[PDB]
Structure formats: structure tokens, C-alpha cells
């Protein structure tokens, strides 16, 4: 409900930072 | 709870915005 939500929406923040650290590689 | 997806909506824009310059770049 929150605690799983919480977990998640780091998740998908740290899944965004993964992708900026591949972007930033290609470049 | 709204801020929960509104939040998590914003998290999939920036998502969509670095798939689409990785995207261009490849290009």
C-alpha cells in the first residue's frame, strides 16, 4: 500500500539514474 | 493519495524524455 509504493518509486528513480549513466556513456 | 501517481507519471516523463535522447543519439 505505501511501503511497497515507497519501494517502487525509488526503484524507478534509480532505473532513471540508470539510464542517464547509459545516455551519459553513449555520448 | 493522487501524489503517489501524479509523482509516478512525472517519473515516467523524465523516463520517456531519456529514451528519446538515447534514441537520438544512436541516430
Same mark, same amino acid.
Given at each position: @500500500? *505505501?511501503?511497497?509504493?515507497?519501494?517502487?518509486?525509488? @526503484?524507478?528513480?534509480?532505473?532513471?539514474?540508470? *539510464?542517464?549513466?547509459?545516455?551519459?556513456?553513449?555520448?
Amino acid at each position: @500500500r *505505501a511501503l511497497d509504493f515507497v519501494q517502487q518509486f525509488a @526503484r524507478m528513480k534509480e532505473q532513471l539514474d540508470t *539510464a542517464k549513466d547509459q545516455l551519459a556513456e553513449a555520448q
